[PDB]
Write a protein that binds this ligand. Structure first.
Ligand SMILES: *SCCNC(=O)CCNC(=O)[C@H](O)C(C)(C)CO
Length: 246
């Protein structure tokens, strides 16, 4: 189907057309993460031969995620959300980032794609398309510590980058990803180049649930628990729980 704001809001459980304020942005962001799961299971099926994101019609993505109710990956979910926010009146700018790996280092510079919103003189980070543990409500572009559902966040400056860092209960600060704010671009999605483990996740009311391969992670009010799933029926119950949304 063709991109439609009203249909999208209905998909994520938002009623009416709330006004273009910070309180609305916080609600949209959290509802989107609860309703629309991250899922890379069929991402390669939507890759274009040319590696230019522009050759992937926005309507194809909209059909898969909003009309048919499936999940997607960062350059699908945040691409759609950018378009929704722009239609709702926000000043949204696209930015790319390098992700802190499982080995502790940062990956390629443009692996991850998300957005910034400038509103009433402050800049907020917007990301509804990151598979791992991260923020469910927008962050201020500030090194000042910020708290959401028992987790702490901050956006520090290191070596020409801004670094999103997260600190759950009983753990030290850990980078999530890093980006260059000066490379943000209102039209950045039109320039994105797309040059075996399954990753699925979604937010809950008070945290997030994440399944990478057999590794099942939950955070609830900042309290983390992990379990390497063995049984086939428990594994499928966890997949269904994530993909059904909330
Ligand atoms: S389209 C966005 C691509 N980025 C991406 O898949 C990040 C995956 N990596 C992580 O999420 C992180 O490095 C782990 C493995 C530590 C899990 O959060």
């Amino acid at each position: 189907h063709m991109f439609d704001v009203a249909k999208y809001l209905r998909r994520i459980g938002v009623e009416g057309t709330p006004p273009p304020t910070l309180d609305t942005l916080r609600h949209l962001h959290k509802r989107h993460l609860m309703a629309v799961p991250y899922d890379n299971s069929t991402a390669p099926d939507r890759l274009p031969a040319s590696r230019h994101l522009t050759n992937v019609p926005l309507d194809l993505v909209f059909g898969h995620v909003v009309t048919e109710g499936h999940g997607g990956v960062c350059y699908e979910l945040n691409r759609l959300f950018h378009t929704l926010l722009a239609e709702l009146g926000y000043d949204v700018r696209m930015v790319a980032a390098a992700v802190r790996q499982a080995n502790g280092t940062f990956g390629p510079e443009r692996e991850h794609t998300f957005d910034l919103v400038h509103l009433d003189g402050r800049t907020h980070l917007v990301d509804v398309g990151f598979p791992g543990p991260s923020y469910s409500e927008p962050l201020y572009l500030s090194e000042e510590e910020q708290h959401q559902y028992g987790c702490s966040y901050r956006v520090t400056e290191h070596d020409g980058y801004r670094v999103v860092e997260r600190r759950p209960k009983g753990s030290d600060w850990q980078p999530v990803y890093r980006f260059r704010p000066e490379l943000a671009d209102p039209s950045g999605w039109d320039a994105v180049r797309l040059d075996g483990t399954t990753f699925r996740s979604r937010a809950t009311d008070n945290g997030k649930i994440v399944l990478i391969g057999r590794r099942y992670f939950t955070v609830e009010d900042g309290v983390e628990r992990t379990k390497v799933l063995v049984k086939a029926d428990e594994f499928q119950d966890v997949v269904d729980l994530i993909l059904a949304g909330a």
